[PDB]
């Protein structure tokens, strides 16, 4: 099942501007400035820009939460692996999308050296079909299973991954973008997607791609993604008449923002 497949390049960085904000809870609010303290992506922080296909997809730290974004139309990115040792010694969380659904499992997975999903293409380049699942060699001691609907100009998809008190929380947003290779400058809050009562530790994670077998070996289209990290900061959130967050102030950004947060402006 597993396939042995890698050149590493120095990192590139982009400007997060004012993105990565999400609804802190499920309480409806409107026409109000609400101050909250939570894990948010710091304003104007440096976000790492990864290119899956120049080929490697490195294991990254999870820290205290992750902001993930991608801009691809080929449906190359399928899912993520979250865990610690990422082997049969401990429980790991596997979140993978396929052709019709999304499957989330927590098991003592023994993952492949370089895990992926296999696909193949039609005579044309507008159609594809699944081939084989090559993410792990074995799995046992399963404690959690969940199945639902799929999670995944250009299409911009944004996710936030948090792990608090055993609950793995996912937020998401899907919007159109008209930029070639950057993050949009504007504001949009992410909404709750799913809340999984798993109860495990996560320190590292990896992104799973769908690859096809070419005459030059296993490859994919020009998939790329951005990774940022959350910090404990105070935000002032502006709820409009319809209860939608339309703006925000990062109270730790600078003296000007501190003044705005103090005066609730």
């Amino acid at each position: 099942q597993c396939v042995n497949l890698r050149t590493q390049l120095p990192p590139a960085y982009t400007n997060s501007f004012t993105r990565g904000v999400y609804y802190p809870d499920k309480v409806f609010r409107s026409s109000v400035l609400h101050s909250t303290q939570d894990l948010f992506l710091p304003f104007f922080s440096n976000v790492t820009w990864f290119h899956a296909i120049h080929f490697d997809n490195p294991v990254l730290p999870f820290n205290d939460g992750v902001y993930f974004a991608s801009t691809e139309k080929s449906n190359i990115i399928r899912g993520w692996i979250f865990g610690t040792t990422l082997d049969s010694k401990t429980q790991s969380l596997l979140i993978v999308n396929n052709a019709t659904n999304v499957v989330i499992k927590v098991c003592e997975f023994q993952f492949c050296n370089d895990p992926f999903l296999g696909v193949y293409y039609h005579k044309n380049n507008k159609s594809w079909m699944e081939s084989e699942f090559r993410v792990y060699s074995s799995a046992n001691n399963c404690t959690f299973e969940y199945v639902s609907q799929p999670f995944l100009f250009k299409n911009l998809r944004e996710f936030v991954f948090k792990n608090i008190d055993g609950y793995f929380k996912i937020y998401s947003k899907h919007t159109p973008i008209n930029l070639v290779r950057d993050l949009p400058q504007g504001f949009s809050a992410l909404e709750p997607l799913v809340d999984l009562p798993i109860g495990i530790n996560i320190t590292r994670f990896q992104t799973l791609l769908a690859l096809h077998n070419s005459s030059s070996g296993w490859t994919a289209g020009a998939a790329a993604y951005y990774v940022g990290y959350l910090q404990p900061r105070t935000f002032l959130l502006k709820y409009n008449e319809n209860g939608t967050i339309t703006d925000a102030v990062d109270c730790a950004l600078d003296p000007l923002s501190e003044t705005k947060c103090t005066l609730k402006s």
Partner: antibody
Framework: EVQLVESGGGVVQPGGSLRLSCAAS????????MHWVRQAPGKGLEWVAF????????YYADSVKGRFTISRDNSKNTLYLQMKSLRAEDTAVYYC???????????????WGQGTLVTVS | IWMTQSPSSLSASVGDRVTITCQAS??????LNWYQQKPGKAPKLLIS???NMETGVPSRFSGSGSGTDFTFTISSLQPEDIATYYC?????????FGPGTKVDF
């Protein structure tokens, strides 16, 4: 491509102080925590201090606790170690490193610097 | 957590099997690193998580164990394997390194 370069070593007197630094490049420095490790001539390795990626939580070895301070600046990719009240016993080569750690740092890669010698006399 | 290693030193010829023992005063499950240091150089990581081999490490190297007792093994000692080997725990802060075992020719 990945580099860690220590500087600020030299010779100081007992009771004095010395500020060491480590320049990082080739990797996402601001995503990882960092460690200081020292090795005296003829001796084995000894762990000194650890700082988290955000520069928040800090940890020290009992032998340096109360004397040494660890800090970092993620806008310059620089790690610092400020040592006060230095003693003869503190003579050692100091390294900056990113140690592989699946519990606290979440690091999948192991990186080491060159080492800078600090002598107390 | 206190760490110790045994023997403090050993010598063996090329082709010999070399084993190094590392022990901990506390149960640290499977959270132990093995490093190889040559004179004048920084330590290199060979094994993590007790028995997980790092990429690029020769197949002649191996290791196993858990809790308070760990073993590092070289199935066939090479002339290039003359180095001081250390065990390190990362179960709980502060982190520590063992005394170091010297392997001679």
């Amino acid at each position: 491509e990945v580099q860690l370069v220590e500087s600020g070593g030299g010779v100081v007197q007992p009771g004095g102080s010395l500020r060491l630094s480590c320049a990082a490049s080739g990797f996402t420095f601001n995503s990882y925590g960092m460690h200081w490790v020292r090795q005296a001539p003829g001796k084995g390795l000894e762990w000194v201090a650890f700082i988290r990626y955000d520069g928040g939580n800090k940890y020290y070895a009992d032998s340096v606790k109360g004397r040494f301070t660890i800090s970092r600046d993620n806008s310059k990719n620089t790690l610092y170690l400020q040592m006060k009240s230095l003693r003869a016993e503190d003579t050692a080569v100091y390294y900056c490193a990113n140690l592989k750690d699946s519990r606290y740092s979440g690091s999948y890669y192991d990186y080491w610097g060159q080492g800078t010698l600090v002598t107390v006399s | 957590i206190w760490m110790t290693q045994s023997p403090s030193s050993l010598s063996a010829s090329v082709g010999d099997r070399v084993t190094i023992t590392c022990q901990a005063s506390q149960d640290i499950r499977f959270y132990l690193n093995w490093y190889q240091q040559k004179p004048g150089k920084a330590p290199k990581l060979l094994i993590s998580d007790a028995s997980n081999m790092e990429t690029g490490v020769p197949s002649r190297f191996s290791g196993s164990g858990s809790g308070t007792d760990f073993t590092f093994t070289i199935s066939s000692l090479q002339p290039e394997d003359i180095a001081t080997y250390y065990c390190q725990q990362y179960d709980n802060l502060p982190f520590t390194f063992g005394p170091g075992t010297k392997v001679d020719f």
